[PDB]
Structures are given as C-alpha cells and as structure tokens.
Amino acid sequence: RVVYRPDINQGNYLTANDVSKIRVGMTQQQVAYALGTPLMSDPFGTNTWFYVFRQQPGHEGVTQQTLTLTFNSSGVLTNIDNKPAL
Amino acid sequence: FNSEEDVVKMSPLPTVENQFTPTTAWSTSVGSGIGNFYSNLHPALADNVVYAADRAGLVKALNADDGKEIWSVSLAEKDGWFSKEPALLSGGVTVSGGHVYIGSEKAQVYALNTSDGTVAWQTKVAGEALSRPVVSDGLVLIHTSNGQLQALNEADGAVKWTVNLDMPSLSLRGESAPTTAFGAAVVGGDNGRVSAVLMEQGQMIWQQRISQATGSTEIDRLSDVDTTPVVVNGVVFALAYNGNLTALDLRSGQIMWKRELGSVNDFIVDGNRIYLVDQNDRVMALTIDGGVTLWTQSDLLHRLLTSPVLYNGNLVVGDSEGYLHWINVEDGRFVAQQKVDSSGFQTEPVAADGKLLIQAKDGTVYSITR
Amino acid sequence: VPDNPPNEIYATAQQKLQDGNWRQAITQLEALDNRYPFGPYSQQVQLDLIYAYYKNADLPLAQAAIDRFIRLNPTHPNIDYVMYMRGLTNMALDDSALQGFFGVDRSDRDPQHARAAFSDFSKLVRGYPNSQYTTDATKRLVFLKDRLAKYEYSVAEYYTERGAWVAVVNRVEGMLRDYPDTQATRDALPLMENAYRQMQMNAQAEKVAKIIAANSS
Amino acid sequence: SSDSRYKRQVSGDEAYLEAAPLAELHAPAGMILPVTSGDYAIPVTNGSGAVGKALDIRPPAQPLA
Amino acid sequence: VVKDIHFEGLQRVAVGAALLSMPVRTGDTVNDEDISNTIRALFATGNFEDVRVLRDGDTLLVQVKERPTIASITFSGNKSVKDDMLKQNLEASGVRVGESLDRTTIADIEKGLEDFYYSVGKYSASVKAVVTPLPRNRVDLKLVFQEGVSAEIQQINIVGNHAFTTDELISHFQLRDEVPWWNVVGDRKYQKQKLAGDLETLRSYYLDRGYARFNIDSTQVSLTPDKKGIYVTVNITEGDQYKLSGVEVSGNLAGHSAEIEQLTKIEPGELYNGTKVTKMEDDIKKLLGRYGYAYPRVQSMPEINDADKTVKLRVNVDAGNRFYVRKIRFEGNDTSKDAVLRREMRQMEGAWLGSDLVDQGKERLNRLGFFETVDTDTQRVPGSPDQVDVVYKVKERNTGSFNFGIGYGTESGVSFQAGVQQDNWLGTGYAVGINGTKNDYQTYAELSVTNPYFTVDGVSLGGRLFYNDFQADDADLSDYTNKSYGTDVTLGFPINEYNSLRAGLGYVHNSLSNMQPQVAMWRYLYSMGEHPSTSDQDNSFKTDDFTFNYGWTYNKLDRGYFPTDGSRVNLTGKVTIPGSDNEYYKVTLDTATYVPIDDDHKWVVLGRTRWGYGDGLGGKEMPFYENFYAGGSSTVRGFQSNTIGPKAVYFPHQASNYDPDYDYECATQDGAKDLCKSDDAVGGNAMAVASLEFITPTPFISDKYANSVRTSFFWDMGTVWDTNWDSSQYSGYPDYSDPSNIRMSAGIALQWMSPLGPLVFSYAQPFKKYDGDKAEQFQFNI
C-alpha cells in the first residue's frame, strides 16, 4: 500500500464543445485544424483516428473518453463513435 | 588584479639647473578635493581676484594679496530629494565683470554674481556641462558633453542657439569651450567636427571634419585631451580630439586646410609662434609655415598630465606628481626646477596680470611667481 | 618531439604502432602531421593518426579527426576506410564503459551514438557495396538496429510499467514503422496488446492479437 | 593501451557475429504496416568479405612519392 | 608559345597544382595580356603575391616565394586572459589559425589583438612579434604583448533624475563606481554587456516605481584612455508617477477568461509597475501553460493618457494548439539506464505539454544529481503544428567514493580498508556502499544496498548490514571484545511531493566481553540491573535490539551535490519495540539550508544544524554504543574523529583475568594504583552541532570550473553531553550534564570533487577554551 501517487495524464485533451463541433463529411485536414494532430493513430488497416483523453488521479476512479473517427481512402470523416467515461 | 601594468612608467625629472628660482609659493586650500576625477576646474583672475572652486560645491573667492578668503559659498541644496544633496562640480570656472559662471556635471550652470549682492541663478542645461563656459558679448556658451552646445543669456539664463553636434560611441570627455571671434563661435566636438556656429539662428558653417578621433578609429589609448580651437587674425587653429592639427583660414566664411601634425592636448599661440604639448606628452613648438616642427622633446613622455601656459618668455608646464617644468630662454635650454606638491596636478594653470596661478588635485591655488 | 628525417620518423612510428605503444605513437604521428600538412606521407600519417586515435580510445579526437579528413579530401580510394572508422568510432562510444566490458546491464543507455553509427554504416554500405569492409558493415548494421530496437523496447517497457499507455503505443509504433525486423519488435508487440486492452480499445487489441498470433510459431 | 592484448578486438565486448538474424514480420490478411518510414534498413545484395576481427583494420598501404 | 615551364621552391603546392592554378598554361599563345593575366592572378588571390615572371622564349619562369607555413602558438604576456581563450577568440571568430602570414597580417593581427583587449575592458599598448623561421617552409611567431590591466576604473553619473538619489540608482547596477571589494556580490567587471544591464536595470527601477513615460535616455561612456577614465553618464528624463486604472484582455483561447480576469484584477488607485505587469504577463503565460498552450503570444500594451496621468493596460493573449509531446529524448546519459532518467519525469510522453511540468522534471533530475547540466530544450518536430520533442542534454559524471587504505602498522600487518560508496550505481539507479575494514585485529564490515525505485511510485527499499568485530585488542582478551550483528531494511515512500517518510525494521545484536574500566558502562549495567563487578573484567553482555526505524526527509535543492537555494531536513528515529534484550529511544535531525546571497550563485551561505537526543525507555538508559560523537568529519573540523563529548572516567582494577601489566595505564597496576581521572571519547546521549560555511570561489582560484571545487570558510559550534548524569558518582571529576562544552572552530575547506580523487583540505583553528579536548588542524577526507 502507498497512501498517494502521481496524477497521470495521457493525450488527446478534449472538451464538450471540442467533441461536439465536428460532424460527418469534414475532411481530415479540417478535423486536425479543429481538434489537433492526433497522436494515437492506427497504422495497419483503415485510416482511422483514435482520440483518447485519459486521466488517473491519486488512486481514485478513472477518466477515459475515447472519440474514434474513421476516414476512408480519400479521407472523409464517417462513422464517429464517442464513448465517454470508460 | 587591476594593477600589473607593465606599461611605460613616468620618465624621471631631468637636471635641476634653472636661472629663476621660484621666489614665492603662496598657497591656499580647502582640503578638497578634485581627487583623481578628470575634470576641468581652474582659478580665474578678474581684477586681482582669484575665483577658485573645487568639486564639492565650494567656491572660495580669493584675492591676490597673500589671499585671505572672501565670499566662501557652498553650492548644494538641502530641500527636495536629499539633505545637502551631495553634488559634483566638474565645472568650468570663468568670470565676466563680477559674474562668476561655474558649470557642473549634475547638469547645472550656476552663475554667482558678486556685483549687486549674490545673484545665484541655476540654469538646467541638457547633458552635463563640462567646458569652461565662455562669455561672448551677451551669451554664455556651454559645450555640454551630450554633444549639445547651449547658449544662455546672462542674469536670468535663457536657452537658445541650441546647436546639436555629433557624438561618437565613446562620447569622450572632450571639453571644448567655443572661442568667440567676429560673431562666430568655433567649437570642437567629440568626433572631430570642428563646427563654427555663426549665430544667425544657430547656423553651423561646416560640411566636413577631421576623419580621425577616438571612437571610430581608436588609436593608442593616449588621445586624452582638452580641445579648444584658437582664432588669430582670421585663422582658426584646431587640434581636435585625436591628433590632426588643422588650419582654417576664414575668408568671409570657413575655408579649410589640414596640415596634419598630431599629438594634441592643448596649446597657446602668440603671433607667429605655436606652443603646445602632445598626447605623447612632449612640448612641440610650431611656426606657421605649413607646420615645420621645432622643439622635439622626450624627457617627459607619459606624465599623466602636462598642460602649458606662457608668460614673459617663460613657458610653464603643469604636470603630475606636483612639479612645474619651466621652459624659457628658448632652446637649447629645456630643463626644469620646481616641486610644489606631493599631491599633483590634473588641471590647467592660468597666467594673467603678470600673476601665475595653479589649481592642485588637492589644495586650492598655489600661485608661483618668478 | 624529435627533428628526425621524415623516413626515419615514419619508420619508427610504424614500428611503435605494430608494437603497441599507442600513446607514444600518437605523439610522433601528430608531430609528423604538424611538420608537414603536405606530402603523400602526410595523407598516410592522417590515416595512421585516425587509426591510433581509435586504438588508444581517444574517441572524441578520433571523430573530430575523421570528420576533418572526410571534409578535406572527399574523393580517395580509402574513403571506404574513412567512413568505416567513423562508424566504428560511434560504435565504440556506444559500447565503451565498465558495464559494456562486464557484458551485463546495457542496451538501453544513450542510443545517440548508436543512431549515428547506423547512419554512417548505412552510407558506407550503400555507397560502396563492393568493398572489403562491406559484409562487416552489414553485421554492424544488423547488430546496431537490434540494439536500437532493444532501446525502444526498454523505454516502452518503462512506460507500460508506469501506466503511460499512449506513450507505450507510440513507442511500439516507432519500432514497427522504423524496423519491424529484430527480435525486440516481436517481443514488443504484446506491449501493444496489453496497452490497447488496458485503454479498452477492443477491436484494435484483437487486431494486434491476430498479428502476434500469426507471427509467432 | 595494451598488456600484450587487443590486436583483433574492439574496446569492450564484441557481439558483431552473435546478432539475431533479421526476420520480416509476416502480415495477416490485410494488416500491412509500412515496412519502413526511415533510414533503418540494410541492403541484402552484399558479401562476402572478411567478417569479424580478421580483416586488415590497419591503414591500407599505397605508394609513396 | 611557351612549351616548357618549371617551378621551383614551391614546397607547399605541387608544380602541377600551381600550373592548373594560374590561368595561363602550355599550348596557348602567351601575349602581353596573358602576362597581365598572370600578374593580376598573383595579385588578386589575397593570400600570397610574388611576381617574378620571366619569359625569354618558350620558357616561363614564375618564381613565387611562400611565407607559409607558419604556426603562431607563442602567447607571452597573459596575466588576466588565458591563451586558450585568446586562441578561441581567434578561431571561433572566423580568424582560425591556419596561417600564411603575409607582411600586412603581422601588423593587422597586432591591431586585432589590441582590439580584443579593447573589447575585454582594458588596454594593451605594446605588441612585439619576432619571426622564427626553421628552413623547410616553417616559421613560428613570438608574440610578446604587454598588459595595461584595468577592469573597474569607473565614475558613474546619472543626470536628470529629480526623484531619486544618484547613490540609490547606482547601487543596483552590475557596474560599480570604484567601491571596496567587500561590497561585491558576484561578478563586476566592466563590459558593454554590463552597461546594457545597467541601463535596463535603471529603466526597470523607474518603470517599477511608476514612471511610465520614461524609456527615453541617452548613454555616453566617456573615456580617459589612460586605462583609468571610464565615466558612464546616462542622461535620462523622468515622466510623472502614473496611476494604473483597469486592464482589458483580448483573449483567443477555448475559454479561461474567468481565471484570466481574476488573475488580472487591479485594485483602484494602484501605481503603474513594470515588474508587476511583467509578472502579470508571465502568470497569464503559466495559467495557459498548465492547461497546455505552451507557446501562446501575450502582448501587453500600456496606453498613456496625460493631464490626468492615466495608464490603460491592454493585454492580448492568443493561444496556439493544445497537446504536443511526441518523444521525450534524453541524450548524454552514456552510463545510466534512462529508465532512471525517465522514472524522474513528471511530464509523460503522449500528453499535453506543461512548461511547469518539464521544469519540475529538470529540477528533479538535478536533485538526484549524479550529473550536472541544465536543459529542457523543447524543439518541435518538423511538419506539424503540434508534437514538440522534449530533449534533455544531461552530462553524466560519476559520483563514487573509492577509499583506499594501505597500512600502516609495525607490530601489525598491512591493513586493508576499502570504502566504496557508490550512489545511483553506474550500472543502474541503485546505491551500494561498502566500508570493509580488516585492520589486523578489527573486522568492520558495512554493506548498504538501496533501490530508490522498488515500485513505480517511488518507494525505496534499503538494507544495511554491519558485522562489527571490534576488538582493538592487545593479546587475546581483556580488551573490549565487541560483536555487532546489524541488519536493517527501510521501506521509504515519498508522500509530500518533496517529503519522504521511511519505515524500517532493524536487528542489532551486541556482544560485549571483558569490559573496559569506564563508570559510564557500569552505570548502564546498573541501569539494566545486571549487577557487575567493579575491579574485575570478566563481563559478558549479550543483547538483541528489534528497533523500529522511522525517518522523515524534506529535500528541495536547486542542484545536486553542490546545493544552491536549498534546504534539506533529515529526521531519523530509532524506537525499540517491546520484545528485545535492550530498550532505547533515539532521535536525530540534520538540517542543511543553503541560501544564496548572490543572484549568480557563486556566493552561498551554508547553515547546517543537527540535534541528537537519546534516552532509554522507563527503567533503562540508552546503551553507550549509540552515544553520539562529533568532530573529525563533516561535523566539526578542528578535532580528531569522534572526540568531542563527555570523557568517561575509569575505576581502579589490579586484576582483570590477568590484567595485563605495563599496559592500560590510568588506574592499573603499573601506573597509578589509586583513583584516576580518565580522558577518552565515550560519546553522550545528546548532541548539537551548528555550523555556517561561506561558499566562495575567490579570485585566487581559476574559475573555468563551477562544478568541481567549492571553497568554504566555516564557523562551527559543537556540543556533546550526557543527560543522564550526576554528581554522586562524578563529584571530583568534571560534570557533564549541561550544554556548555561548545567548541567554536573556524577553518578553510577546499573541496575538489573531481570524481575519483579529492584533495579536501580542511584546516581548522579550534578556539573555545575547554578542558580535555583533543584537536587537529589538518583534515583530508575522501
């Protein structure tokens, strides 16, 4: 047992407005201009972009909101799945 | 750590033969205080009165009668931003009538009138006045080392003729009191500009200069000098900041010709004979023939001060370590015999009315007479 | 520092080099370098000096001298040898220490020297595939890439230890993209498996599971 | 620098010839990954020369003039 | 048509190379224009020209003599600058030394050196060069240059102020107006950089006091170049005191305007303040940096409205983009698992950059030490508006104590003491210390292995072991036979982000045979109740200690081993749990607070103070083997090791199982047969040592190193006393129950920790008059 630990933050900071603004059909260049250059990409398979916002403080709970986007061969946002809070 | 200087040390004093034994060293003092601050203060002689000063804000009006003190004033205020406000007077001292103009590097020019009471009016000139203020038929000229040349009206102070000379990066301690001549004040500058101000609205009649000085072409660090052009008969001799002697033959306006012969500290001219000292610190004599030198001399190289003054065929030289090298019955005789101080000199000796006077770096005035 | 004739001084220098008095040898070679920067013997002495630096293990001096030589004369039959010792010198900076002589506890110190060595050896092999040093350079490169992969596996291990899951995924990304060849990468892929599973990226984790299962025998 | 040692050796250990052979990762159905994106790749068209510390690491000779 | 051309006396360039070099050659008709071409090609090169072109027929004799090659290596005349620095200011300038030296360049580089001396702040009037040619083509230059040293030759002046004294403004300057040396704080020497610093400082002073209209000031550095006249005159013009009234923010960011506004709220009637507005800027910068925008643009504009003296503060803040870090690269840690250097970072790759977080990282690396270099370069990747790569350049240098002891004994063989204290063990992050001493009759083994990391969080697992076969015997017995079996494991977790709390267990087994004659030991024996003899040494004492070992530590050092701006507190407390053959309660506390006086941190005041209070639990007294000592260490210089403190007095004994004759004086058979006042260090159960050091690289030591020598001048006061003491057993002897044994000692300590060998000079004069002391004026630690 340890009484207290660091607070860990892992990437893709978002806000409610940040996740809300985008919608299907917007090109990935504008998607990046809006959200930021995603740093967790799937390399093998479809041009999909994973958005992860992760934070673990001081032994309590978990904050995991993931916004998965799926661009295609030309690059067009479709099939958005947001899972907030684990 | 700051003192290991293998530089050339002072040459020793030559033989001590001399036809004239100094028969008087009348001395007076305040216990102040030039210190080693390089500045141009010196007593002025007006009607057998010796208006001396020194860098504390002390003005001791003395008279050549064995010299008791008169009119001893302390110029420093107690109000405002400090009590007694320790000032500086690296100032000119000059006299016209009973009007003693002193100018001080706290950006002040005090004028103390011993004429109808004490009219002590302070004009706040820009920069810090450093040259002996010059009286010119209703004007005092102040060549303040911000390159600025103020001109003030007597009895109230009134800024005008506000010329703006050119200053280099080192913006040197070049003092240059403009000599007045035929309504034109010839002022040296800090870069080489020998500007003539022919007062119309403060109109400088010059588009050219001495291209050599300290700051753009630095030389051997010995170009320390007190620069003052001298006008005779219609020719301006200029020895501006670094050594390049120039003749300026004014023919209804400024006309130039540089007969270079360098090494300048300060000089006196008598008709057709020139007596100056060098930055090399030797007393070169010149005849106006293009500048063919006479009197190459070497005995006194690198005496921290050496500044000349003449009276009665006997050239006086005030040097450091408190000596007075006397030149005389013109060469082949050069030797010297005098030692008045262990304090030393850094300031101009003044000869007037047949009386020679010398400030000292500590101890006010030491009149030395044949 | 004698003032012998060039032939005698060079001969003595060579003899001391075969003997193995490397410090003294460096001294007289440097003297022969100063006394003329000209002569075919001058070039031979520059090469001999780079050899002596490498052997005496004066590696910063060796790197500086070899870069100076490759700058000064960029076409020469021995440019192969020049590039080869620059690679070898970066290599020795990578592998020179007490634990690098113990043979234990290495492969994730600073890799910068290893990266520089790999770049240099790649330039060597690509420039001159028909040369004596080529196969040894190929061995250099395979070992060195394995070493880099171990370094990035070690960093990935530390982040998976601490919880920095996205750092884990990015680092193993770097390994897969830059070199999916060495043993370290095949060792690494379960790190993505666990990382995706921890961040609950289920389809992605199943995908990396498929790749690891297919690749392992 | 020597004690009657270190003529065909490098400072520290050597593992030149004990490296694990390169082995490209097999790709499942459609899961390709960029085999490279950088400088870390080796030409295979090469060999064979004097591998290991059995080559004239000393400065090679050339005529003097 | 010239056909045969021979060149001789080249010796630096081959004949063919020269032949191709000049634009003329064989096979072409050489006319007057071609002759002119050859001559002008000789002229225009700018490295060497020597034209002897004789063409009588078809033979072209071009004779050029080469001044090359020359190496100017002889700098004779340095007294304040180092020839390495001169060669730097030749080479890095772009005037590097590969020399041809045409005749002009002789005087040209003479002037260049004189110009360099003009730059450094002094004068040099004479530079004489002598040519030394050795006949191959080789020459060397003898530069004898004469110094005119002068660094601070000022008289500062400020003309125009009417609301501040000259002295007040001149005080804060980095230049000084010819003031004594005990005024110095750091470095003073006059440079154009110093002048610019002074001007900016003066401007800051006015802008802080509230004079907004002042940014206008001319500067004149007038010079009597008699090396002594440097008068700085900064003629300025003050405005008026200006009242701050309201701030407006032009904010371009995802929304924090509430926090920004509440940070920028100025109470009515305040005075404009330059440093206050700058700190407003920086606090907006950090209020963004925490949340990620680690490259915002913040411009603060003051709008001045006269006749009511109003200033309106208008700050426009625009933020960039949010989350950056892509890789955290350490480069330079050639001898240390980066897993160490990465466990340290509180900024974790794959997240949003926080400038304060990587500042925490850099400081934490420093507080571990083990290396010394500042860097947190955040260079951003090519090709993206995000993604910055956090790159540290550490510069490892090995901390490790390799303590060698050879001899020396005459009736005793050559001793072997090895003390190797390695922290952050260059293999790993571990710390192992071994004090293994076999001195011919003494077997003192100390092993200490500690993991600073044993989980991810930071818990530290540290075991210590001492096998102490301490005899210091004469033949085989009756000489204080002592055995110590010491094990202890300490699990210590950091929880207050700078505070470690340690809890450990410890077994200390103490075997005591053939007791020495000290009343202190028999007082302890009576305390335990084991009734002893008083004139016979046949005493045996087996005891085992199960000590709970709790510690606490606060560490905030802006450096590693040479702290500045730091304060570490170290509490260590042994409490023996019930269930042991012995009882005691000991508490130690160290405090090393370095506070810097200078801003440059080349002058520091060390204050280190340590208290120790040990007393046995109810019914017992604290066993003497843990009585504190002092002196002869980094505790109190000016004494032999472990000497300060109460002296134990001996009881008489004329038989101690054959009490050896002609040995062990002070109340034995051979010496005095009756009561003896005995002096020897036994240590007391209370300690207080407080020392202040002055850390000062003096101008007598060459500062090209700021990391390998620390020079201390120290005053230290140390006391050791018993608290369980009486006069019913010590009536005629001195009484040790009051803190009055203060040793005051002052000394110089030159501490040169180049990793492997220190010449740690500690010369201390101890002067506080007290009796029974044992002093020593030379300590060289290791």
Numbering used by the authors:
A (entry chain E): 25 to 110
B (entry chain B): 23 to 392
C (entry chain D): 27 to 243
D (entry chain C): 26 to 90
E (entry chain A): 25 to 806
Please quote the paper that reports this structure.
To provide more insight into the state of BAM within a membrane bilayer, we prepared BAM-containing nanodiscs using E. coli polar lipids and initially characterized the samples using negative-stain EM, then moved to cryoEM. Importantly, we observed an outward-open conformation in all reconstructions, indicating that the membrane-inserted state of BAM is indeed the outward-open state. To support these therapeutic efforts and to elucidate the complex mechanism for how BAM performs its role in the cell, we report cryoEM structures of BAM in nanodiscs composed of polar lipids and native membranes, allowing us to conclusively identify the conformation of BAM within the bacteria membrane. And contrary to the other recent cryoEM structures of BAM in MSP1D1 nanodiscs, we did not observe an ensemble of clearly distinguishable conformations within the periplasmic domains of BAM. Although two crystal structures were solved in the outward-open state in the absence of BamB, we note that both are stabilized by crystal contacts. This data matches well with the cryoEM structures presented here, where all structures of BAM within a membrane bilayer were found in the outward-open state.
In Gram-negative bacteria, the biogenesis of β-barrel outer membrane proteins is mediated by the β-barrel assembly machinery (BAM). The composition of BAM varies by species with only BamA, an OMP itself, being fully conserved across all Gram-negative bacteria. Structures of BAM solved by X-ray crystallography and cryo-electron microscopy (cryoEM) show that BamB-E interact with BamA along its periplasmic POTRA domains and that the complex is overall conformationally dynamic. The full extent of this lateral opening was observed in the structures of fully assembled BAM where the barrel domain of BamA was observed in both inward-open and outward-open states.
